[PDB]
Symmetry: C5
């Protein structure tokens, strides 16, 4: 039962793909285990680079495949290194870049909380043969958060476990349990850009929408309100070409609907003001004086929806 030490160096976590629920992660893996001693020039340890490694395995070297469970496709592997010690122990080293998968709820975008996840598990050897002794995760990052899209807030998670499969092969006595390394990183979205350039002008759209009411005439009140729709729709497209594609509504997505409603409500009100009467033009001078009523009556719908 080989105790295998692992260490993951996270260099960059970037390129989150919103629809696929996918992100890319650059780094190095370091795997070590103690086999039993080998002969070698002097009393040195050896360095074995890239192409010369399989030359070593062809002569019967056991170098186990350690698989990234949650990666999408095969990872781009840079330089690889075998360090063979005289006492027996063996360092495997490789740089990697791969696209990883994980469940990502974006409903409350751009205020979403997500976590970048790594899961490592040997491909061919169960826990009785190859199991992970201990694991360090080195995230060489700090400061300059206000420039990055994602703010790592935690440091790094680490969890060695045993996973068993009950539906198998049909070798069963104990080829059921593989030891699995899982790395988690909590990160928060930098909401700044969407706040000041998307949320903020939207509010100004909706507010100024309501000021259709301090128009004097009815025709003005109604006609103008159409120009306002033309406006929200226009604001929809500007939002939509640009915001990341999803299969469910975000916060902003709703705000737009809220825009549409605010108004459709205003259209009905404007017609009602005019046509609830005892003559014809009995404008409910207080319902037309929903001048400061309904802008706040819109806040009732907004903060109830916070609950």
């Amino acid at each position: 039962p080989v105790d295998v030490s692992v260490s993951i160096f996270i260099n960059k976590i970037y390129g989150v793909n919103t629809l696929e629920q996918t992100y890319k992660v650059d780094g190095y893996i370091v795997a070590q285990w103690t086999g039993k001693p080998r002969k070698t020039p002097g009393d040195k340890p050896l360095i074995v680079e890239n192409t010369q490694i399989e030359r070593w395995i062809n002569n019967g070297l056991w170098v186990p495949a350690l698989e990234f469970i949650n990666v999408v496709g095969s990872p781009d592997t840079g330089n690889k290194r075998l360090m063979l010690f005289p006492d027996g122990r063996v360092i495997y080293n490789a740089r990697f870049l791969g696209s990883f998968s994980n469940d990502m709820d974006f409903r409350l975008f751009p205020f979403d909380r997500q976590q970048f996840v790594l899961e490592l598990e040997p491909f061919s050897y169960n826990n009785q043969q190859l199991r992970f002794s201990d694991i360090q995760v080195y995230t060489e990052n700090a400061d300059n958060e206000e420039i990055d899209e994602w703010w790592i807030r935690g440091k790094a998670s680490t969890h060695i476990s045993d996973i068993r499969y009950d539906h198998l092969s049909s070798v069963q006595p104990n080829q059921n349990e593989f030891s699995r390394i899982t790395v988690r990183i909590d990160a928060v979205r930098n909401p700044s850009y969407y706040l000041w350039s998307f949320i903020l002008p939207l509010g100004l759209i909706i507010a100024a929408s309501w000021s259709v009411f301090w128009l004097e005439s009815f025709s003005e009140r109604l006609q103008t309100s159409f120009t306002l729709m033309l406006t929200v729709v226009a604001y929809a497209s500007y939002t939509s070409n640009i915001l990341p594609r999803l299969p469910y509504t975000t916060v902003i997505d709703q705000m737009i609907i809220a825009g549409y409603g605010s108004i459709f409500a205003a259209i009905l009100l404007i017609i009602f003001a005019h046509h609830r009467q005892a003559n014809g033009v009995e404008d409910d001078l207080l319902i037309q004086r929903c001048r400061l009523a309904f802008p706040l009556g819109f806040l009732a719908i907004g903060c109830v929806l916070v609950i």
Copy 2:
């Protein structure tokens, strides 16, 4: 006639390409068959990973090529494992990610119902040489319907068959028969997002389309409807740049056609109302008060395209 057991592990199904009638699938194939009994180190089964598999094949290990029939181009194959047993049987283990094809009808979008399909068939060995014994597909799926894009309803459907090829080699008697595994997953689209954010606002527009009829003046009636047609056009672009690429109209696309018609029909009435006569300035007192005549007339006809 070699009996080969197969097992498919579906890991992620994502990236539906609507035009290419294409979807991406991450998973594993497992193939096992009984060979001639061998001598392994000790007496334990012997494990052979990646690079040395080719070495084993080159010295004569029969590993049949199993081709995915409906894959587009050759797929990203991860790790390969040969597990060689002393009793004879051989266990093939390999991870894959591929683009797969199937006829996919999207006309009833976003209410479309689909089935994701896999087809596996040996490349060079017919049914009299290589035969598919049995097939289980392990689809590690459940829950979160609500939140992500596709709702699986099936579990894993299956049909092992013999395929007859009419036009061949220079082979004669019965070697036109290949055994093929076909794996099916029935699935439904989560229409929530398109319902609330696309269908709903369109309705408010078409609702507002009709609100031109509560305008008082004639000049007011026609100028207004032009801004209103401009508005539906504005909505089309917002819609189209976002919606999936297709070669036919969706349900949504029709709603848009219905929008234009609504307005264009409204234009005809308004002009018709004004210049048909019996003095000169004959406002048809009833026809203009069709204010909620055909808006329900859209609700009647809309609920007519039903079937």
Copy 3:
């Protein structure tokens, strides 16, 4: 002069790239020719898949390179199979996916008819050496044209010809003639979507444009047509996001020009009626009574461009 029979299996034709004049084709090549008698294992044929084919060539099996003339870059080659017969003949089988080139006129879009073409020609052996005996191409044809972007209508033509190069290397006597396979597939674009979501609404825009003439005031007539000019710009971009990139005008693109033109023509008429004059007020009430005139002529000028 080795006689080589070939067969092409057309699996999918997709992804027409209009500017590159490029489309994708998935399939198989089957090359068969008769070699010198070999003594095989047992007496039935020996099959060589993928990896092992390369080692057979190194020890001197002649497997001629067959290149796709009209492919863009090298094709994604799938499984490879060498089937070696005892009477001598050898059958090569390989799966491929590649992007192909051909002259593709898209002017009559969305009614363009194309032909997807495969041209096969030996790389190193001219017809004195390697000759194409015959070729059938099996298209996986039938039904569901209405769900597909392209409607294949011919069942492909085929003609083996000999192609001669006047301009060569330092080879002399008659090594300037190569035998070439040409596969043509007649295909038409599915016009449904482009008709109903693009042509139809556009027609109504141009029509409703003309109803500017039923306005009573001059001021209205002119400030109005600016909204309409605003609409054709609007309709263009909506078409523009979507329609395939070209270096020439399409049919739709023409319709848009006439739209711009129709209103700019209206602007001139509207002003002409109004300010050339005997008066100030002398809109020739019959020249402005081109409300139903100018629509007849748009079909006259419209149906000539069919010329």
Copy 4:
């Protein structure tokens, strides 16, 4: 000093990447030189394709690396062929699809004409070791420019020179001059589509912009001009989605600005016209019929950027 004859067969030039300044080229390289007399099967020439070439080199065949100086990344290598003659001479043949770099001016878009360039230069051998004897470039060209994106009008140019590198290896004797083949192909952009679907309508817009002055009222005159501001802005977005992203203004980019200016200048006139006064109402009695001044006044200025 090995004399090497080279010939390039140009198959297709496509995919101009405007921001990267790169275009892709399909074709073949043909290089020939004389080696030392060899023994061939019989006495006929020997053909060596792809896989077997690698092995000829291990046993000591001198195959010089000819590098594309101006390629971006390494090119897609198709089939390779060695034709080995008994007297010694050698013919190298390869298909390529490559990403090429060259300086490209787009300021005068869409009327730009460019020259596509290839530069070939040995990777390891100076001119005294390897010298380029001559180069023919065969561009299989003719006809239907009207369907293609680019109109090649030249017939391919040729330039062999010696290139000197001042700074070093540090093998010094003369190290420093490599023989370089430079190939140029002159081409013009097909302006047809950009003329009729962009230039023409922009003009009608700017033209109709001037139609604001034949309005009788001031409010009509000023309010309307806002719509034209919206129209030019609308036309801006419509243009920008389609046009090539660049780091400088094109002819069209300016033509748009000319629109903005024509309208913005009109605004100042219209404002100036009404309120700088001797009464309240002092529209300068002849300045409001600046309806025919400013349009030709835009044309004099338009004909000014001659320069």
Copy 5:
């Protein structure tokens, strides 16, 4: 401690990826060092290109792997050359295309200054085995900034330093030592297109925004003002569709915000003016005379917001 020469020939820097903090670099690397004296063919140096290098390493040749630390994924490598001189020295030569990462602030867009960084560091050899002796960087770049995306200003800075990694595999004395080459290249963005086609028209809108107060009536003063909101929105989409996507505000977007803001305050005034009163209609004849009041108050903030 092996003394190693390095030389970097940069022929292209392109493809700045704004969200990923990424840019591409094409060039060649040259590394040389002195080994133990060798027996070469004849006595002049032997050149080893591509394929034959693997053969040389198998005979026990030490060729060190030099890694680009700040690359994302592995570089696209072209031709490789070994220059083996008889006295011991060895010179490595290779083409590369790589995607590199560096901290990149884009807030001051389009007036940003950046620096492109290359970091070279041995993969397996610490400072007392392999040391970087010296480094020249050849920037074969010059002139014609007129036309390219970036303006190089420096001549690249260079700094070899010793990078020590804090913790280990357990050896303490001095094996935590790596020599690192850092190459810096200063560059500035060409603001020309973004100034003239984005900043300038934006300003005229904002200018013309203020143009609502020379309107006579209140209803028109207010009705028009909604059109300006729509126009600023319209300009947002046009800008955002084309501008590079980022996670923070640029200069231009701020201008857009100020655009929305300038309009919203004017909206407040137009209402403020009319209905604080002693009748209903006594328009503060002084506050719609704020016609050049706060355009300068906006320009004062424009002058001040630069500090």
